[PDB]
Amino acid sequence: GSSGSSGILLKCPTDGCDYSTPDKYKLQAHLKVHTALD
Ligand SMILES: [Zn+2]
């Protein structure tokens, strides 16, 4: 990665995952990738 102006990062709680985002609702929309599949 690299440095720059952004918010505080939130992280995925799931085992073997590496995802992070500055938004709480983008994170909830990512938790659906582990709790459901289509
Ligand atoms: Zn994840």
Distance between the termini: 31 Å
Q: Report the count of strand segments.
A: 2
- SSE order: EEH
Q: Major sheet, described briefly?
A: 2 strands, antiparallel
Radius of gyration: 11 Å
Structural class: alpha+beta
How many domains? The number is 1
Which terms would index this structure?
38 residues; alpha+beta; transcription
What does this entry look like structurally?
This protein has 38 residues and is of the alpha+beta class. It has one domain. Helix content is 32%, strand content 11%. The chain has a two-stranded antiparallel sheet with strand order 1-2. A hairpin with an 8-residue loop joins strand 1 and strand 2. The N and C termini lie far apart (31 Å). The chain binds zinc ion. May be involved in transcriptional regulation. Overexpression causes down-regulation of a number of genes involved in the immune response. Some genes are also up-regulated.
